[PDB]
Structure formats: structure tokens, C-alpha cells
Amino acid sequence: QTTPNSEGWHDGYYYSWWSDGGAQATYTNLEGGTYEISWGDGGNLVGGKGWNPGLNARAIHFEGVYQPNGNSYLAVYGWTRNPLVEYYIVENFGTYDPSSGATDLGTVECDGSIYRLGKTTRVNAPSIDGTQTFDQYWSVRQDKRTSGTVQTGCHFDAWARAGLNVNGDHYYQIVATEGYFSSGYARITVADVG
């Protein structure tokens, strides 16, 4: 079956769970900063735990089990408003790099690896605020990992230096697992280690 879309608070953490309804998937909030996702073929899905509001500079730690089979990613993921922006700091991915086709904005070194920076624009697409036009900011880790600390400030500073607007009002900021026409399992624990 498929866990219905949901967003809110659980055990002191914010969470977001979303799927297009085409995939078979079960999303479960576990205790504290832990969540679990099991998915099969059929569509796009993304869920995870974190904070709301996000910060430009948060030290985010993640660890656990990440076992995709096909198209999938593990990322720090969130939104700002004014302007409306969807951003991704991608720590690991299954088969294809989700930033493919983005405009190349160069590289930066954060938390022990080079990250490739990029941006794309989504026109009349689904957003937290309905159908809107908005940019996506990408920072994609060269040395893939399943645990560690992300200092988000390193990436926001990098996007700013490239000329992107990072002054919006923060909405949620979570460590998300995504699947796209694939199967997999994830059990991820998030924490602020500032």
C-alpha cells in the first residue's frame, strides 16, 4: 500500500513525507530523530526528519542504513520563501546524479569532500505553496557516504558566492531519503551536533 502524505512534528523533530501515489511505500516515524522508509517501484517519494525552521548554518549529523536499489538519493533538503527555493545537499545517490542538467556553478570543499554546485528552475511546478515557479539549488558530494556531519553554512556561503539568493525565510530543513521508480530501504537517524 502507501502511507498517506503527512507533515508536522514528531518527538521534537519536524518531518515531511511525500509521494506521488504511484509507488508502493511505507514511511514510519521512529523515536527521536529516526525514521524508516521501505519502497518499491512505481513513482517518486521523499521523506525525512529535521527542523522547521531551517538555519543557513546548522551542523547536521546523520547515520543509519541506506540501501537503495536504483534511482535514489540521501540529502539535506529544505525550502525557503521570499524567494521560494528548494535546496539539496546530496550526500549519496544510487544510480544517477539528481542534479544532472543543472547549470554548473563550480565547486566547493565542505566536510572533507568536493561538492559540485548547480541550479535549475522549475516552472509551474508543485511546491509547499501550491503551483509555483521556483529555483532549485544543488550541492552534490563527490565522495559518497552514509554517515557524517554536514555544516550547511558551507553550502549556503558557496551558493551566495555564485550569486544565488540565500536570504529567504526558512521553511523546513530535513535529512531526506528519495526514491524514483526504484526499490529500497532506509533507516536514518538525524541530530543537530552544534
Catalytic residue selected from 36, 63, 109, 178: 178
91 is catalytic: no
Catalytic residue selected from 31, 36, 63, 86: 86
State the resolution, in angstroms.
1.5
1, 36, 44, 2: which is closest to 20 by C-alpha? 44
The DSSP H or E segment spanning 152 is helix 152-161
Query: Which residues have C-beta within 8 Å of that of residue 59, sequence separation ≥ 6?
Result: 149, 150, 151, 152, 192, 193, 194
2-194 fold:
Jelly Rolls (2.60.120)
178 is catalytic: yes
- Distance between CA atoms of 94 and 76, rounded to whole angstroms? 16
